[PDB]
Amino acid sequence: AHVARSELAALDKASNGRLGVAALDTSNGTRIAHHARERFPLCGTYAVVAAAAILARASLDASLLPRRILYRRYEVVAGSPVTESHVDTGMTIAQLCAAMLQSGDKGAGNLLMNVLGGPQAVTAFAHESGDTVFRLDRWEPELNRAAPGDERDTSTPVAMVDTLQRLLLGDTLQQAQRAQLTDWMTAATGIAAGVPPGSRVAAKRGTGGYGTTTEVAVVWPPSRAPIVLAVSFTQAQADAAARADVVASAARIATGALT
């Protein structure tokens, strides 16, 4: 027989992995929750909080964003397309933030965590901003291992939504720094492929072991109030292939349900 299911319940059933979705419609407070209080791997989405931590310090220290970091090639791990290409000159802290957020540059992430005080310093910034769920435990690339059960390097979809709203829409950061984080995160798959055409999207994607994809975004549909979204999909087999189409489908269902 046919079993009536919600759109997300049907997507979950058809995808045969573990799916987490949180969304917030800021026009009316509506929340979408699909396993939204279970932990999922952060992967590269920690970079939103790490860049915010840099920016909060930059508000009090005008030398920080233009500070040039000289690094050797063995100081940037595999997965560092931008920092590898500038190893001869070094890069500024601002350039590293852009590279970490826009290009998933893992060396840039580790260099910035060196400035901040390690993954625990990223966690402390989350905690001070009001997020008591987020935990970053490891450096690049091990933070992306995404092993089943493991709570290291995780958060819940609903906490991911709340933190992203505070950072990009709320008052965690000064307005100039909020704008800068937004600009870094706005400069084709996943959430971007599921939102209505013409939407403005500020987003960060992460990927990991166990075929994990985790993505967070603020979405401004054309002439519509912003929706905050967090999606994570992770699979049973350690060598599984990422399924960015599942993330796109979850984003299409959630933004369609709110609009």
UniProtKB/TrEMBL annotation:
Pfam families attached to this UniProt entry: Beta-lactamase2
Gene3D superfamilies membership: DD-peptidase/beta-lactamase superfamily
Matching InterPro entries: Beta-lactam/transpept-like, Beta-lactam_cat, Beta-lactam_class-A
Keywords assigned: Hydrolase, Signal
Catalytic reaction list: a beta-lactam + H2O = a substituted beta-amino acid
Beta-lactamase class A catalytic domain sequence ranges: 20-231
Domain of life the protein comes from: Bacteria
GO biological process: beta-lactam antibiotic catabolic process; response to antibiotic
Cell division among keywords: no
Xref: SUPFAM superfamilies: beta-lactamase/transpeptidase-like (SSF56601)
Enzyme Commission code(s) on record: 3.5.2.6
GO molecular function terms listed in the Swiss-Prot or TrEMBL record: beta-lactamase activity
Family membership: Belongs to the class-A beta-lactamase family.
Protein name as catalogued: beta-lactamase
Species for this entry: Burkholderia vietnamiensis (strain G4 / LMG 22486)
